[PDB]
Amino acid sequence: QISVRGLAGVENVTELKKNFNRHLHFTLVKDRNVATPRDYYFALAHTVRDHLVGRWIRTQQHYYEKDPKRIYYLSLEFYMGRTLQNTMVNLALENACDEATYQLGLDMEELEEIEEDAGLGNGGLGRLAACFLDSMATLGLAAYGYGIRYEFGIFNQKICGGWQMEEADDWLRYGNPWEKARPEFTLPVHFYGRVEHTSQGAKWVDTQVVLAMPYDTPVPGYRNNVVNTMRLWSAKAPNDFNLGYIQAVLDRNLAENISRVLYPNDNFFEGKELRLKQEYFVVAATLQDIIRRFKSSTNFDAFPDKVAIQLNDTHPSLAIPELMRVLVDLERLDWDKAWEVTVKTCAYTNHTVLPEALERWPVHLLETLLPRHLQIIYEINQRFLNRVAAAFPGDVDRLRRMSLVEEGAVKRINMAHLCIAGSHAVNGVARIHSEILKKTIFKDFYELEPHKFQNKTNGITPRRWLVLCNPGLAEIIAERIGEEYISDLDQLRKLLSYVDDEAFIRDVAKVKQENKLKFAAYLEREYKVHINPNSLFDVQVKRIHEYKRQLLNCLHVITLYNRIKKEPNKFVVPRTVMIGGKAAPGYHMAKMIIKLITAIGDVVNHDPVVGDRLRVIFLENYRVSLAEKVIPAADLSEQISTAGTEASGTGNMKFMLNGALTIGTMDGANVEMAEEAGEENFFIFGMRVEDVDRLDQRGYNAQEYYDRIPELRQIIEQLSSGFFSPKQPDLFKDIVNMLMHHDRFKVFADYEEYVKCQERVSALYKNPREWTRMVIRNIATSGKFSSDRTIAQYAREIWGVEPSRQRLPA
Amino acid sequence: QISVRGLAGVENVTELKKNFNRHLHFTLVKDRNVATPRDYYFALAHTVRDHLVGRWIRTQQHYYEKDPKRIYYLSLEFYMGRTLQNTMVNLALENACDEATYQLGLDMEELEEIEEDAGLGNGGLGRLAACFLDSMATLGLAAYGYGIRYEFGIFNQKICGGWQMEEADDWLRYGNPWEKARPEFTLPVHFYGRVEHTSQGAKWVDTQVVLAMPYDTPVPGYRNNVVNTMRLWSAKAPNDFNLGYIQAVLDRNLAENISRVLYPNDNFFEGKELRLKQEYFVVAATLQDIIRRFKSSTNFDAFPDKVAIQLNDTHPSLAIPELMRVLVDLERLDWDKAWEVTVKTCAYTNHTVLPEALERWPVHLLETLLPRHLQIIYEINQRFLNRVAAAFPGDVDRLRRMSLVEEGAVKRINMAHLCIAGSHAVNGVARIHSEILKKTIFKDFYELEPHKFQNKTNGITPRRWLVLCNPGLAEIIAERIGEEYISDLDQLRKLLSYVDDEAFIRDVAKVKQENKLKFAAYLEREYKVHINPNSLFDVQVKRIHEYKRQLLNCLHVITLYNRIKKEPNKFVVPRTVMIGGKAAPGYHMAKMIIKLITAIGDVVNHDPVVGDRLRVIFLENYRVSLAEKVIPAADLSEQISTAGTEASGTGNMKFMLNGALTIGTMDGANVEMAEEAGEENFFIFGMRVEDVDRLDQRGYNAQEYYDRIPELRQIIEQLSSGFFSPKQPDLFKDIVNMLMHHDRFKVFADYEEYVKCQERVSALYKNPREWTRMVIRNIATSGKFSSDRTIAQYAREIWGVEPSRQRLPA
Ligand SMILES: OC[C@H]1CN(CCCc2ccccc2)C[C@@H](O)[C@@H]1O
Ligand SMILES: OC[C@H]1CN(CCCc2ccccc2)C[C@@H](O)[C@@H]1O
């Protein structure tokens, strides 16, 4: 149907059809008379999968022949989403499969909806890893993603009476056609035990063994015939485990629980033993695999020339002492040489400055679980502090500030300090974030080793986040500038010469309207909710946290409702306000905010005076597949975190690429986004980082704003008195109390400027032509935010490898 | 190479080769340069599997069209063994695959050794179910095997210092190519809860739900294009199970433990809750599946015309009250009609008279786990006893003897009594066993309902147990009488006219010698043990239990050793004595017997005076795959249980078919075997059932035999004093004590006649021509013991269906 989706040739369509029928018969053991849509999905998935394996085998053979430097990306999360459409896109198979399935009497889009998300992540961090894998393959890097194959990914969110309910994400129930189990490459992982010292070095003995079984998933590059590997470990008990008999077999679960479930806390730090086990499990198995592959190319001098290890946050920080353990205890390298190799091999990406996310493990846990690793950490610390002492003689407080060991009630290990010490490069994820790191939390380390500190502004893959989810926009763009931009997103700048083009303006607005209509229909078909598709689609989708200030959005929504109730017969730009995102199950306040949003909906959506001028919808079960639906339909992107808190954001970039305007604070990547588009083309409001600092030094008093802003006072009075909860008048007392007395994120401080800025949004929306022209200026300058750019920078500035757009032979 | 293995045509060989290469590339994601033998096995398995599915789909379509009466065989065990060779044999693909793999530069027999046994059974009962499935498909019956897909089958047995060690049988580690998961037909199973009574009947409420997920495995008939289904249930927790969050997900294991592990006790009764859960789980899911299939053909009058349920032992006895529950509580049939349907549908096979195997469940377990079922059982009992009371007025002790409820310290339910009450047919598994049932343990029930009681003598499939494991013998037989006997084993009678044929005699003895050489080589290659292949292969392989009297064999072995030590320079027929079998992990005496066997080996195998005249080997990890190796190599089959204890035996039949002579008591099927061959062609010895009874009435005094048999006295003195355990002199005190004071199985009573009979064996073995002629007379009369005969009798006399040898279209 459309150009960007590839050719639908006669030979290819005929071949896909017969392979589809073959899989339905031989693979699924079905015939057309008993087959359900699910069976048809699987037949197609298997057909498309076959096209990957040829390329998969020769890519890995190619890496064996050419022996390039290998990139190992270690993450506890890979938020992959659905694989079918992505695979078709990257292999140029989408139109052919569309045709083949059409001729079989099937709708492909219907089949695509059957696939479960691979939900092996929480949000931003996990999705970044997934975008990164796509870009590394597209740029021809010999890269491997290493993680854990969780049996249960992020929970499915149900809303019951306005309250979040969790249910297990049993994503493997029907099987996963994309993975290949590799039980032959199973590796042992050691836990507990004790350390023995001998004539010739230390020995870790009396350990409990858990087996790590790998599952490989292919990662296709964009139309370059490169197929990389994501290897995920599954925990398996050894066959002599605990070997009454029956109980010993049943107790195998204790070992296998390691890979059972993803911690759903968006990596808020919870010092749980099971989480530490997960962290070591991925690290220990991965490093054995890395060394094995290296030896099959004694002299570890060349190790850093052939291996790069990227630590995604501090979660795999145990790679540093585990690499030391292997080189010193097993390979018998001396400490100094082993350390040199370790530092040159490892690099660390920091993802946030917020203290609640910082991993600080109690020493007593490491003592019991990983006794050899604790000894190595102590030695690293000692030698690191000796360097600090020599560089800044007599500076005793620097010594305690920089120590990897934190003293106090319970001694802890600061994993971020470990990572900086043991890595040759440390990067933040947006310019403002990387600057804050050097100025605040890692200032001491920057003073000692300034060369280590870098920035790598985050990005998103234009394959999934434009071509896949918004084919209509990808197509109208391709018509004017060709298809090259899909792997060279800087080419969207060429769209600036179409900002005064009346045909293009009409087409952009047309694509948006079609997306909005399609999403409005989806909401009715699957959730029975009615929305006006002519209203401004105002959307905030992201994990529920206080720093993201969903509550600030709530205050604006209520302001609009109160203003309508005051002057009902006055014209207001109609809005559909959509908010979605999961709360961590044990995060009481986050769950209360969800309830508040639904409670506002209950009042606003049923007021006859309001009509269809204002609607408030909580988007249930926000996840990658839903993101691909809601983002192309958005008009306004809410990016309103307190300045200095959102390290980067990536959702912001997704909205920019897809034709939404942004209302946001000068935080994270919002700053670079506004810089690229021009500030006149963004709706910036609120305190900057410097203003936040000034307020903290003076002392934040929320009562001041309440006293001086009558519209704000009314809302708080409404919340307190039970306007939004008639049967439970006191329901929101905790929210009000937090807002009034202990708000870390200064919601009231930005309220006035936010409401004012929102008025400016509504004014522009009244002028469709000028709205769309500003949209075009956003889309046209979104090029910097491709993960191809991000990964090219990692490659050249950290990993020391050259990206390549050159095809491998088909 | 050989005739019985089918054709190796040019088109078929070329097609197998390309499909082999296709699976290696697309399915295994490998190429020849990285592939291991395991990969080659899987490529072949997938290639052969493809040939099944076409036939599998049309068989099940055929059953849907013709709507025949369906046979449901319910068992907690199916001891399937390996599937690859069996599939090739039944599809006539063996020579073609042999050729195809040879041309690819691969040895097929090597690939066949890679397959794990499907070890979902303990021994005789599980293997019977597996032979039965093969025969039902071969005889064209619309039959379904229903069981549990255990994650862990029977443990692997390791011998360490003469002691049995157990390790988990992780049979699914590398995947199972034969099964097809059917998550779409997942069914809910209910546990716990309570019973509510309403205006319109009882309701079972507040239950915990466990999901039953089916896996289907194909069962090919012999060369008839019939492919039946074995459906095995896997336990799955529902997604809202227990829904802190992490713990709720981890606690899913509690529900899923139901299908985790096979109880390895050879069905010695252990009243464990988990076992009861397993029993209900298979029953509840199976019956829902049966009713579903029946409704997709209101009027349950025709239910018994379209459905037969065979209860394999009492393990699935809960089918009776579960069927009543469904018909009464859910379908709202009246009791009397529901009961009529239940009785006409169900039939029960008893497998033993030994009390330790009898299932008698504590009422308090059923009260908590299955409260509605207990109420139904009580009602069945009440109505049953009213019938007893009317038939035998005033016979109060009959009432208590026949009750399904046993009173005492703890009240129990007698599951065997439930089965007789609720079934239209009850059968034993050999003529002597079925007679004992009517005369002893079920005498009261036989008096009430004589028509219910039947015999169905067990059998074995001649496909697995001749053609597959002994191709050399199958071939020399086919040369004389053709191939028809493979599905018509009565034709072996034609071999009687070759008993004086010098060429045939030479060939039979040649096949045996080749088998013995092959097995002697196997023992060295895989276990580094040296045996003389010119010795008499004296073998006893079967589960270790006191009733099977492995100890009687041990006493003979020691007698031979003592006789050699007394007269070293006197000629004795050389023997290799092989004993193998697993002991239940908690069965102390069985484990001590294993240790004794190895301890005897330690003394006998290293005595220079003995030389290679006597060897004692314990065969490690006895299982189906090992049976297929050792049975064709055997000269003497030990079947020496105390008369009246071994209900049938099936190992005995396997040895008879494969050219071994039998030394045995008049027990189980041994009686019918001797009757078929003629007693002159069997080595029968020892007490008959009647002699055992006489001894019990008089009182068994083991001391009498010790006092009067000096050779026996010497052995006991040797055991007691530490001759076979120098470093632990008292090691065998428990064995001696049991033999002397509490031997339920009268080992000493049969000692003299056994030793004497063994002398007669050795005498015949000295005359190779006369040994072989007697062998020919055994093989020639083994026809009755085909499971095709057994199943034809079940079909006609219990299930009311006609077997068919007619082909389905290919
Ligand atoms: O780098 C990927 C994302 C990583 N996240 C990490 C969020 C960590 C966090 C989690 C809970 C509470 C506070 C902080 C921040 C975003 O700005 C980034 O875009
Ligand atoms: O019917 C299959 C077999 C069933 N077995 C059941 C053995 C049951 C048992 C298990 C432990 C202790 C005593 C008895 C007896 C054999 O004679 C039969 O051949």
UniProtKB/Swiss-Prot annotation, chains A, B:
InterPro entries recorded: Glycg_phsphrylas, Glyco_trans_35, Pyridoxal_P_attach_site
GO MF term (any one): nucleotide binding
EC number: 2.4.1.1
Enzyme category, top tier: transferase
Post-translational modification: Phosphorylation of Ser-3 converts phosphorylase B (unphosphorylated) to phosphorylase A.
Catalytic reaction annotation: [(1->4)-alpha-D-glucosyl](n) + phosphate = [(1->4)-alpha-D-glucosyl](n-1) + alpha-D-glucose 1-phosphate
GO BP of this protein: glycogen catabolic process
Site, as annotated: Can be labeled by an AMP analog: Y144
Modified residues (Phosphoserine): S3, S403, S487, S720, S721
Modes of activity regulation: Allosterically regulated through the non-covalent binding of metabolites, being activated by AMP and inhibited by ATP, ADP, and glucose-6-phosphate. The activity is also controlled by post-translational modifications including phosphorylation.
Keyword Ribosomal protein: no
GO cellular component, one term: skeletal muscle myofibril
Cofactor(s) essential for the protein: pyridoxal 5'-phosphate
Modification Phosphotyrosine occurs at: Y192, Y215, Y446
Annotated AMP binding sites: D31, Y64, R292, R293, F294, K295, S296, S297
Coiled coil region boundaries: none
Site, Involved in the association of subunits: residue positions: C97, C131
Modified residues (N6-(pyridoxal phosphate)lysine): K654
Protein origin, superkingdom: Eukaryota
UniProt xrefs under CDD domains: GT35_Glycogen_Phosphorylase (cd04300)
Alphabetical keyword list: Acetylation, Allosteric enzyme, Carbohydrate metabolism, Glycogen metabolism, Glycosyltransferase, Nucleotide-binding, Phosphoprotein, Pyridoxal phosphate, Transferase
Family to which this protein belongs: Belongs to the glycogen phosphorylase family.
Role summary: Allosteric enzyme that catalyzes the rate-limiting step in glycogen catabolism, the phosphorolytic cleavage of glycogen to produce glucose-1-phosphate, and plays a central role in maintaining cellular and organismal glucose homeostasis.
Subunit structure, interactors included: Homodimer. Homotetramer; to form the enzymatically active phosphorylase A.
PANTHER family, per the entry: GLYCOGEN PHOSPHORYLASE, GLYCOGEN PHOSPHORYLASE, MUSCLE FORM
Name of the protein in question: Glycogen phosphorylase, muscle form
